[PDB]
Coordinates of C-alpha atoms in Angstrom, one line a residue:
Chain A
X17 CA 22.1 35.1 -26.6
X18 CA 22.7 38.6 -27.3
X19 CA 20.2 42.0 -28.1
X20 CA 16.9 39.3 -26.1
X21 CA 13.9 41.3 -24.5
X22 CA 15.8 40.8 -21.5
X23 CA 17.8 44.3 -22.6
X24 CA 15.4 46.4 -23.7
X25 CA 14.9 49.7 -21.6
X26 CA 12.1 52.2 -21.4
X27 CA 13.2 55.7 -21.2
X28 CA 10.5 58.4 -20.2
X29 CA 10.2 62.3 -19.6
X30 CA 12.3 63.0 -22.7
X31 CA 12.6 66.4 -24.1
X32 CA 10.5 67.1 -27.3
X33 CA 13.4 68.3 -29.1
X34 CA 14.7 64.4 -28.9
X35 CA 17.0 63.3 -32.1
X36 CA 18.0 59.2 -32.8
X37 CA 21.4 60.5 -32.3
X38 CA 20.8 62.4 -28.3
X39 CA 19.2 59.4 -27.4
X40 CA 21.9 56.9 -28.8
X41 CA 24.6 58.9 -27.0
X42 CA 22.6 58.9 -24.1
X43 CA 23.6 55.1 -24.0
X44 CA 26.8 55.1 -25.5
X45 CA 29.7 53.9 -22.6
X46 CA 27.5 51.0 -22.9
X47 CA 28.0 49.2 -26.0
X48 CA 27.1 49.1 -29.5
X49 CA 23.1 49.9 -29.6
X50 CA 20.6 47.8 -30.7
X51 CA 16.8 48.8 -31.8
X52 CA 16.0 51.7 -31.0
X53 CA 12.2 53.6 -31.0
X54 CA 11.4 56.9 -29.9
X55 CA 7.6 58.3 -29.5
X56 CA 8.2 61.8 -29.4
X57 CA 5.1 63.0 -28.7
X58 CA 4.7 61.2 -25.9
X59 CA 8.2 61.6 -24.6
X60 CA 9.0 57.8 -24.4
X61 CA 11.5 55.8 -26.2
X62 CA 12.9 52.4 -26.0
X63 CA 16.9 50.2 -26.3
X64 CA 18.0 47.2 -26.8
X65 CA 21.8 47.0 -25.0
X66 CA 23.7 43.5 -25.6
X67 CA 23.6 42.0 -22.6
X68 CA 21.7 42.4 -19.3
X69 CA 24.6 43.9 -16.9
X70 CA 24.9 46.5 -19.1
X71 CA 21.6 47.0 -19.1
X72 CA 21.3 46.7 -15.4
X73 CA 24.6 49.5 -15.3
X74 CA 23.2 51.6 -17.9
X75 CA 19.5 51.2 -16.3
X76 CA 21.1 52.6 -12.6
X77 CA 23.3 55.1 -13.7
X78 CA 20.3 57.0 -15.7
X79 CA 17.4 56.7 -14.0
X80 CA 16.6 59.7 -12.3
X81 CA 19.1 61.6 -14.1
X82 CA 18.8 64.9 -15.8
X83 CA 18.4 66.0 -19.9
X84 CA 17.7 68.9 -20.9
X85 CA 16.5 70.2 -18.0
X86 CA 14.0 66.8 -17.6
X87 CA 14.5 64.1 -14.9
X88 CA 14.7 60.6 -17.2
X89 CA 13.1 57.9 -15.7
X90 CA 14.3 54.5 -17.0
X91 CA 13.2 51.0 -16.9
X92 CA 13.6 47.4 -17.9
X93 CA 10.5 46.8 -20.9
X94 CA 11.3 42.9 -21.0
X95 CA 7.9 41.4 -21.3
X96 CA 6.6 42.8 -25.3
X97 CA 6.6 39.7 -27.0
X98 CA 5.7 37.6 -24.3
X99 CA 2.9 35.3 -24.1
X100 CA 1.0 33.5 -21.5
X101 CA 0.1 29.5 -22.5
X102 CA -2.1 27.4 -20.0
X103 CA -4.2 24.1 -20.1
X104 CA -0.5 22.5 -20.7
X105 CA -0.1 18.6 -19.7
X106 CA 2.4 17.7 -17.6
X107 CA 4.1 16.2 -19.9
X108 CA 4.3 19.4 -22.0
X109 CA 8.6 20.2 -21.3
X110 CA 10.3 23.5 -21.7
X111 CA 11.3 22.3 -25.0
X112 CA 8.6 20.7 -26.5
X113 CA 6.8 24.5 -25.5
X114 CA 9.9 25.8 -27.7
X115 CA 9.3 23.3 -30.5
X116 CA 5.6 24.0 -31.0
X117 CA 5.5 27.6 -30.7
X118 CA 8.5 28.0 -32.5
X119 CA 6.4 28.0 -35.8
X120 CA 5.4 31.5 -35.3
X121 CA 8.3 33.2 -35.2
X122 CA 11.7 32.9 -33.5
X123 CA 12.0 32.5 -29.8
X124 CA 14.0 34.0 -26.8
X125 CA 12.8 31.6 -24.1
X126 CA 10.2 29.4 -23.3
X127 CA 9.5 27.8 -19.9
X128 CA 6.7 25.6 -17.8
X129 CA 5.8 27.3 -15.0
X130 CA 6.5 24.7 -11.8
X131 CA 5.9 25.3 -8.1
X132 CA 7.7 25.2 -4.9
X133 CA 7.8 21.1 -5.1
X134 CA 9.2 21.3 -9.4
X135 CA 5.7 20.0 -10.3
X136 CA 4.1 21.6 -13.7
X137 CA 1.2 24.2 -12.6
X138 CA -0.4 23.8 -16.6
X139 CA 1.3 27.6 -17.2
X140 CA 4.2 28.2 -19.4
X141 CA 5.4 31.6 -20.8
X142 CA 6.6 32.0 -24.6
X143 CA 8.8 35.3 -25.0
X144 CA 9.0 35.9 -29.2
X145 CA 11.8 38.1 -30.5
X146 CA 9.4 40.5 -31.9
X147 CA 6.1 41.7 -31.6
X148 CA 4.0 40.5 -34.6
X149 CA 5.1 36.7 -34.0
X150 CA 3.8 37.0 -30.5
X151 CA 0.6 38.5 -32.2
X152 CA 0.9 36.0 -35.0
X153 CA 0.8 33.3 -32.0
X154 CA -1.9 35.0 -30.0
X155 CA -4.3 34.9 -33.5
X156 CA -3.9 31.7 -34.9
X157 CA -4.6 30.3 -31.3
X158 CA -7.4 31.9 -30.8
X159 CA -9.2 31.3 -34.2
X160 CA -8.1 27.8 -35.0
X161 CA -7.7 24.9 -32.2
X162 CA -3.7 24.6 -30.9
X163 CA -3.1 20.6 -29.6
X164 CA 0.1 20.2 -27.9
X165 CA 0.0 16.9 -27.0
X166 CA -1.7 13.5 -27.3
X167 CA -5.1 14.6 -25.0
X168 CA -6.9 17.4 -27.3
X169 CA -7.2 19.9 -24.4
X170 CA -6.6 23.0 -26.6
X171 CA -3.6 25.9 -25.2
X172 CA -5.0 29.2 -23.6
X173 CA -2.7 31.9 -25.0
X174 CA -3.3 35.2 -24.1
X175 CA -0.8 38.2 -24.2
X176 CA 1.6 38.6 -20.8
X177 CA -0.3 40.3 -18.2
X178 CA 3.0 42.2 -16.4
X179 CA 2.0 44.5 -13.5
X180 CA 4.3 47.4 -12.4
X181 CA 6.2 46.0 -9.3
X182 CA 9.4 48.5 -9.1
X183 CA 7.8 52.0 -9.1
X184 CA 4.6 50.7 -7.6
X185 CA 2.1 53.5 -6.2
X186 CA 3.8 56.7 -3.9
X187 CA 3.0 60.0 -2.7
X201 CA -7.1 60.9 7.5
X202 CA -7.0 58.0 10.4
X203 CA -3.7 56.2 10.8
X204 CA -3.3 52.0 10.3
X205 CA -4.5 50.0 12.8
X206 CA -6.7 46.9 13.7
X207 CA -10.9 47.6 14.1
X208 CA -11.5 47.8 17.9
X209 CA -14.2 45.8 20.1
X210 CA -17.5 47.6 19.8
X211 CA -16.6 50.6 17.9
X212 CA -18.8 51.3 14.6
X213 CA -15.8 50.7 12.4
X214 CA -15.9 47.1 14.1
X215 CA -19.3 46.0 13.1
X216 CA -18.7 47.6 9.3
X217 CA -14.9 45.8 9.0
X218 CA -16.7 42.6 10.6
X219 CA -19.4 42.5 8.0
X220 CA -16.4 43.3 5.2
X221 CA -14.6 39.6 6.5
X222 CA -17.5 37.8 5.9
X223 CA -18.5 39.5 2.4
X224 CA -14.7 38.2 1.6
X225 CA -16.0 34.9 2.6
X226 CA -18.5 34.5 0.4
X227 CA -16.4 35.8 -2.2
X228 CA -14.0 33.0 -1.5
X229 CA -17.0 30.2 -1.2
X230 CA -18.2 31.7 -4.5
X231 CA -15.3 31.4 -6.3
X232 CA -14.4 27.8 -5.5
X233 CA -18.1 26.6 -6.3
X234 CA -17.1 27.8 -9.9
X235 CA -14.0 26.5 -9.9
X236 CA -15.1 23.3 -8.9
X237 CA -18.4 22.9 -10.8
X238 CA -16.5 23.6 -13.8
X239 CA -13.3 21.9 -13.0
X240 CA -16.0 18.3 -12.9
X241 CA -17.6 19.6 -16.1
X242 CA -14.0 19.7 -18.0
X243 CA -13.2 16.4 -16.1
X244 CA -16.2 14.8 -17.1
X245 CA -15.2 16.1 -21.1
X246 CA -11.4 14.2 -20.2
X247 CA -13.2 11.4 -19.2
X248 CA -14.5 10.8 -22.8
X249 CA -11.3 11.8 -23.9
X250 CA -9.8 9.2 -22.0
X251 CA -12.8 6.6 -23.5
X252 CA -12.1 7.5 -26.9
X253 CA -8.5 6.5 -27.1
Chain B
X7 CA 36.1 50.2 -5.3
X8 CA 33.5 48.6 -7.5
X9 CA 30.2 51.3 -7.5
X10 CA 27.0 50.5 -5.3
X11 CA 24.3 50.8 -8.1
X12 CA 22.2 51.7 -4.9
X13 CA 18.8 52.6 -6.1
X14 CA 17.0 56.0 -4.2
X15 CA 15.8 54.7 -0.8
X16 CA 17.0 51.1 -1.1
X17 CA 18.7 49.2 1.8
X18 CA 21.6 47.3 1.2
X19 CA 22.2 43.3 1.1
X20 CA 18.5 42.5 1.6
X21 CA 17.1 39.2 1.2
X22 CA 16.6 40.6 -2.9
X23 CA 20.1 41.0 -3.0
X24 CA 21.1 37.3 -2.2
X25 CA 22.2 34.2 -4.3
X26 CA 21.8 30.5 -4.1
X27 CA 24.7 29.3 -6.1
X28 CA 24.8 25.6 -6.5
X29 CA 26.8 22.7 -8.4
X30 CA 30.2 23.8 -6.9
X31 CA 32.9 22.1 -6.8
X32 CA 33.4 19.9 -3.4
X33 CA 37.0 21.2 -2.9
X34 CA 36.1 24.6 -3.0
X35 CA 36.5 26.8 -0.1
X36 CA 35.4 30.0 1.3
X37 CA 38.3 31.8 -0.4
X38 CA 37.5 30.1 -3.6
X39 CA 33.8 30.9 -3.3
X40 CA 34.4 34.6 -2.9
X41 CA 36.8 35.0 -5.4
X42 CA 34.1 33.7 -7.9
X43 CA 32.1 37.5 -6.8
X44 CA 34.8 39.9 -5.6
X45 CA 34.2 41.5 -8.7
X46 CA 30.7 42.6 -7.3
X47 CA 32.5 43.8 -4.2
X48 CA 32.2 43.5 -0.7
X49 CA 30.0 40.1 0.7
X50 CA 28.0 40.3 3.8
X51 CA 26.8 36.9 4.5
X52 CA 28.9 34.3 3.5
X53 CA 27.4 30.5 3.4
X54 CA 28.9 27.4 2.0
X55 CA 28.2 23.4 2.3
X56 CA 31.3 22.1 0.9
X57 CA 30.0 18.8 1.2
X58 CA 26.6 19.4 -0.4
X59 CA 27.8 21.9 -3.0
X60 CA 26.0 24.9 -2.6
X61 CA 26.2 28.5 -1.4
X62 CA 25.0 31.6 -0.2
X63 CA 25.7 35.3 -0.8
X64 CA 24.7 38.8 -0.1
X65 CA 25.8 41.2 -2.7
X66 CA 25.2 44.9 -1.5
X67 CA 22.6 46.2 -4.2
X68 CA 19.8 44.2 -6.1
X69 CA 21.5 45.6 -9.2
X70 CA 25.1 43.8 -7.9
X71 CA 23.1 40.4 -7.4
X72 CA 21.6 41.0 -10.5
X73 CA 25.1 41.7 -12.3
X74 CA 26.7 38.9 -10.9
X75 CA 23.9 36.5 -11.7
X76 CA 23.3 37.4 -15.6
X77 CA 27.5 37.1 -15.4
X78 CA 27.9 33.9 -13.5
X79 CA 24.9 32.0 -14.6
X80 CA 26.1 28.3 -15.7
X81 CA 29.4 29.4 -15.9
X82 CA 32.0 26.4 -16.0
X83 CA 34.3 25.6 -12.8
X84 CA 35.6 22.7 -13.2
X85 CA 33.4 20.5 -15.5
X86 CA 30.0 21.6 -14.5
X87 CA 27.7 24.7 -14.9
X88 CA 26.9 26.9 -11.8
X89 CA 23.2 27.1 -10.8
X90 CA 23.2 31.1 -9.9
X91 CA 19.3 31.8 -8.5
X92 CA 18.0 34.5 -6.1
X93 CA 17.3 32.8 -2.7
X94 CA 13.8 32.0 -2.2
X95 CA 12.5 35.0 -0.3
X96 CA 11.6 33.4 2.8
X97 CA 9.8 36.5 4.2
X98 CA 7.5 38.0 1.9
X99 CA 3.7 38.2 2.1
X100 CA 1.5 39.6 -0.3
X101 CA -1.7 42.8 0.2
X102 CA -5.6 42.8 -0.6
X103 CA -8.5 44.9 -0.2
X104 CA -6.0 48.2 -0.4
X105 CA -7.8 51.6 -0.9
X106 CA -6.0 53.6 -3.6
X107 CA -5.0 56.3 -0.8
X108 CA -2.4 53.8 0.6
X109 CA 0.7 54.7 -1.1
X110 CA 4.1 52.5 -1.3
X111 CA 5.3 54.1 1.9
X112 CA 2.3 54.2 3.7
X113 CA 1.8 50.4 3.5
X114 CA 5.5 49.7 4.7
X115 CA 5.4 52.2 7.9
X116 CA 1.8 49.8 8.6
X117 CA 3.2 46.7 8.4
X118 CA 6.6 48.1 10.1
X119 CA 4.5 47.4 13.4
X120 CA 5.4 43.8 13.4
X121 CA 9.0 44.3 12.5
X122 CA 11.9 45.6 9.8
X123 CA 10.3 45.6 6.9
X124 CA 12.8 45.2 3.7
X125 CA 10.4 46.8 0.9
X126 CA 6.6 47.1 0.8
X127 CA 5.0 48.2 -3.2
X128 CA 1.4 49.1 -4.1
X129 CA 0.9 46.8 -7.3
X130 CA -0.4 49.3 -10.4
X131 CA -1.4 48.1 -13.8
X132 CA 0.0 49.4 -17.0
X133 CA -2.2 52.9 -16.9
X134 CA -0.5 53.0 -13.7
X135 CA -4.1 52.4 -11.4
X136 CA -4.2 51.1 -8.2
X137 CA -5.0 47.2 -8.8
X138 CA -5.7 47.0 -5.1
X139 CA -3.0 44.3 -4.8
X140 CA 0.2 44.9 -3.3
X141 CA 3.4 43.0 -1.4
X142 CA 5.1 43.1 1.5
X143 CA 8.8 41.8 2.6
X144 CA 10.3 41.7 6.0
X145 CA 13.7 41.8 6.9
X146 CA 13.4 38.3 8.6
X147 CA 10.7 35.5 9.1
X148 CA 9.3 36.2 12.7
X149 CA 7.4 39.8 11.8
X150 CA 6.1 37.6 8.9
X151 CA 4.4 34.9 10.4
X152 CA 2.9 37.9 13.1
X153 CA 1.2 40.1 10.3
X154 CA -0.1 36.4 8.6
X155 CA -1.7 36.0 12.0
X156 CA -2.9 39.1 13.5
X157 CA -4.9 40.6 10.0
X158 CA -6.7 37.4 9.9
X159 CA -7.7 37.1 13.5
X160 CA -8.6 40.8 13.6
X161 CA -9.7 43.1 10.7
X162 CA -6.3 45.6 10.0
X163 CA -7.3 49.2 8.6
X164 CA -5.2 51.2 6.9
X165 CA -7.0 53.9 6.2
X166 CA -11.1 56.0 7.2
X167 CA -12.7 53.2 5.4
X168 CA -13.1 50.1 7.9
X169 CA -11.7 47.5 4.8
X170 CA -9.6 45.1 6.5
X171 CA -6.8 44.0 4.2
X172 CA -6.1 40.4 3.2
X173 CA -2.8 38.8 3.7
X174 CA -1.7 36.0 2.2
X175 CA 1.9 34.4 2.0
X176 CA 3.7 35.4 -1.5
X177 CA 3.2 32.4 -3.9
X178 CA 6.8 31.5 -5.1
X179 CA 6.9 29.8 -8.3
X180 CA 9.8 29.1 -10.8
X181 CA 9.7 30.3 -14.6
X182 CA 13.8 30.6 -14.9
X183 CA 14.5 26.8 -15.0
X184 CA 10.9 24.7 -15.3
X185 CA 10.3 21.1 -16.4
X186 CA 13.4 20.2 -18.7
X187 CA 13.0 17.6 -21.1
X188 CA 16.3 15.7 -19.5
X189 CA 14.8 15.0 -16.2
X190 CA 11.1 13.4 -17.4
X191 CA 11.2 9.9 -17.3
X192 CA 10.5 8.1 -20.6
X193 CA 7.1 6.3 -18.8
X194 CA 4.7 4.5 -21.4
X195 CA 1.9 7.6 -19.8
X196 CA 5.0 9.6 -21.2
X197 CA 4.9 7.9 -24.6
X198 CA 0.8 8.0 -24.7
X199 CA 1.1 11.5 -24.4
X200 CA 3.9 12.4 -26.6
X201 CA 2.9 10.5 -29.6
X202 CA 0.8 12.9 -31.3
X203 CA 2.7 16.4 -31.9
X204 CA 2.0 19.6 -31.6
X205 CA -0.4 20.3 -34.4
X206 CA -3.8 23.0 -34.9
X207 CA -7.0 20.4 -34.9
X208 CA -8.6 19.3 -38.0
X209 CA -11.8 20.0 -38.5
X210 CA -13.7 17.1 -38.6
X211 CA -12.2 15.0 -36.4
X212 CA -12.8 13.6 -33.2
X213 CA -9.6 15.9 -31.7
X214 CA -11.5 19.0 -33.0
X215 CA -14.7 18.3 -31.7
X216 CA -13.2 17.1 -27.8
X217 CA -11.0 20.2 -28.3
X218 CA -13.8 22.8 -29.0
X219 CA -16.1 21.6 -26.3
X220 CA -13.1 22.0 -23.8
X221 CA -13.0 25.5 -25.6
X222 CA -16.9 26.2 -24.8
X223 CA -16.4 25.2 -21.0
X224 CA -13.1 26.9 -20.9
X225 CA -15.4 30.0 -22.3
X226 CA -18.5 29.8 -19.7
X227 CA -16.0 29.3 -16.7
X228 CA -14.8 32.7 -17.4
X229 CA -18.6 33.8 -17.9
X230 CA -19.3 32.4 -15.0
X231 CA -16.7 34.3 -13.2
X232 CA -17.7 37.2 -14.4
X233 CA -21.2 36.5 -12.8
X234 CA -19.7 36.4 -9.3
X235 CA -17.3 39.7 -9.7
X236 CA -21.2 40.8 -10.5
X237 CA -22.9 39.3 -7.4
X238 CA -19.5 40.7 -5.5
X239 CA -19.9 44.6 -6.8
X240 CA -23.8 44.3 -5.5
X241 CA -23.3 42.8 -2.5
X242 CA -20.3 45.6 -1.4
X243 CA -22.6 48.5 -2.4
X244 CA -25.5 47.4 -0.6
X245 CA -22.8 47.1 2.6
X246 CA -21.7 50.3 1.5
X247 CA -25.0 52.0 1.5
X248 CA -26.0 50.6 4.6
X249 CA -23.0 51.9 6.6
X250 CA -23.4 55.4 5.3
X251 CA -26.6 55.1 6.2
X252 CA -25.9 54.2 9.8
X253 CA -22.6 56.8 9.8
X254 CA -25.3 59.6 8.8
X255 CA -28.0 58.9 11.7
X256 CA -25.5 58.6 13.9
X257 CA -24.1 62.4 12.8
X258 CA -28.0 63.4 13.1
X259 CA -28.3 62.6 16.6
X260 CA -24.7 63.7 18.3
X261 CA -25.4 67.1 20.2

């Protein structure tokens, strides 16, 4: 299981003056390079290494280090060709998720998300080795109507929504909690129970709608 | 002798930079056990249930625990495959309501009031824009359970702006190993279920018309949720309004 999105790395602040060949060198020690991309306008390029230590040693020993007078900033870029898939039955395994997506394109890895008890949450992930048959995926189940078992509840799939959590955001009155009677106190009062409603909004919809698609499974259920 | 991999600012063994190994064998011992990972150098907390078959270990950096992991992962020792996982982090809660002046560091010095905290991060999209989400992980339980407490009791401002943050506890959920095929039991619901395979509706059928009606609900839920982000955003600014409002006549009457 060699060359997987799992070893791909983002390399920013590049020079403009960047060759396939500086780049490649930049990761030489490190194996035998895979696919390589470079945007050189925007100063951003991309690797594949063989395996994820040596993208984890080649990731830590460049990041923050210098070329050409610019300080690299590198990063894992793992989640391309990933997709989301929801509205899974429970009887919907890891591999019957490989099986059915698999007609796409070729896959990495695909996975049922469970929770804290092992139980199916209706959420799996499908990680494609290349970009188009992640797109290919995403089209046809948007457009046509994608069944992956016995119950016709059709499969969400919609492109991985990853959120930066390893840079994350850095760089007038200090934390603390609103005091008794202060002006701040009313205002942060009235901001708890906006946040309420919110939250009793929310599960109205969830619920109303959650009846309505029950409801649609009870025919389901009927027509069988 | 074996390189750190310490990234800038990071603390060493942390709860990210811990193992669950499982499926050992029940005549290892706590040499054998660190033999398997003195090749990611020097342990710190050393836990094994011989009789149970699993382990803990703390690896100095997240990129050690990550080395040894993608390395060791279902590995044969003796007949079976090792289970290599990072430990459930027991201590980590996660941010709402944030203002995009609170920075990573600003939101761990905040929450370092009720204890060590381990690593605190202001969630950004893929623009790199404050989301308004972020996470924060203690060094231990106890502060943990504290913050959970205290910013729901009481309204906990981080900056000017009197918006008290939400905290919740992280959710953990597992997308490594999921629902194998293996361990469902061949029920008759099973067999119901798993009789018709995957396949794209025909149109025409009963299947394509159940299936685009759960499509149509599936489509006005979002909608619908739209609608209340819409009733949220009018409701804030007429709160907003109001306590400028207030702020300014106040500012208007002070000698």
């Amino acid at each position: 299981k060699t060359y997987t999105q799992r070893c791909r790395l983002f390399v920013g602040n590049l020079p403009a003056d960047i060759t396939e060949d500086e780049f490649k060198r930049l990761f030489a020690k490190y194996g035998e390079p895979g696919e390589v991309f470079i945007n050189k306008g925007k100063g951003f390029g991309f690797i594949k290494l063989e395996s994820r230590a040596l993208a984890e040693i080649a990731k830590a020993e460049l990041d923050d280090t210098p070329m050409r007078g610019r300080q690299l900033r590198v990063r894992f870029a793992t989640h391309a060709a990933a997709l989301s898939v929801r509205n899974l039955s429970p009887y919907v395994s890891n591999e019957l998720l490989e099986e059915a997506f698999s007609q796409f394109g070729p896959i990495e890895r695909a996975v049922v998300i469970v929770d804290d008890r092992g139980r199916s949450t209706g959420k799996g992930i499908v990680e494609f080795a290349s970009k188009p048959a992640a797109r290919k995926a995403f089209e046809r189940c948007s457009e046509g109507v994608f069944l992956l078992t016995t119950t016709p509840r059709p499969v969400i799939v919609e492109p991985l929504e990853q959120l930066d959590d390893e840079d994350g955001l850095p760089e007038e009155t200090p934390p603390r909690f609103a005091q008794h009677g202060t002006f701040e106190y009313e205002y942060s009062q009235r901001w708890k129970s906006l946040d309420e409603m919110e939250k009793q909004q929310r599960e109205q919809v969830e619920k109303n709608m959650k009846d309505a698609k029950d409801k649609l499974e009870s025919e389901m259920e009927d027509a069988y | 002798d074996i390189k750190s991999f310490l990234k800038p600012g990071e603390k060493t063994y942390t709860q990210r930079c811990r193992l669950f190994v499982g499926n050992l064998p029940t005549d290892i011992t706590e040499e054998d056990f660190k033999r398997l990972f003195e090749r990611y150098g020097e342990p710190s907390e050393v836990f094994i249930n011989r009789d149970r078959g699993f382990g803990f270990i703390r690896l100095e950096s997240r990129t050690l625990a990550e080395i040894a992991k993608a390395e060791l992962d279902g590995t044969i020792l003796k007949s079976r495959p090792l289970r290599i996982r990072f430990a459930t982090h027991g201590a980590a809660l996660t941010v709402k309501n944030l203002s995009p002046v609170v920075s990573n560091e600003l939101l761990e010095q905040a929450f370092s009031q009720f204890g060590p905290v381990e690593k605190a991060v202001v969630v950004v999209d893929d623009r790199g824009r404050a989301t308004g989400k972020g996470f924060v992980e203690f060094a231990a339980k106890p502060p943990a359970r504290k913050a959970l407490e205290r910013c729901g009791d009481g309204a906990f401002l981080l900056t000017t702006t009197p918006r008290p943050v939400i905290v919740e506890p992280m959710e953990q959920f597992d997308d490594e190993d999921g629902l194998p095929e293996k361990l469902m039991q061949k029920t008759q619901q099973y067999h119901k279920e798993r009789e018709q395979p995957p396949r794209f509706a025909q149109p025409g059928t009963f299947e394509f018309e159940y299936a685009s009606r759960w499509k149509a609900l599936d489509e006005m839920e979002k909608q619908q949720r739209e609608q209340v982000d819409r009733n949220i955003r009018e409701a804030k600014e007429k709160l907003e309004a109001e306590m400028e409002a207030a702020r300014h006549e106040h500012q208007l009457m002070l000698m």
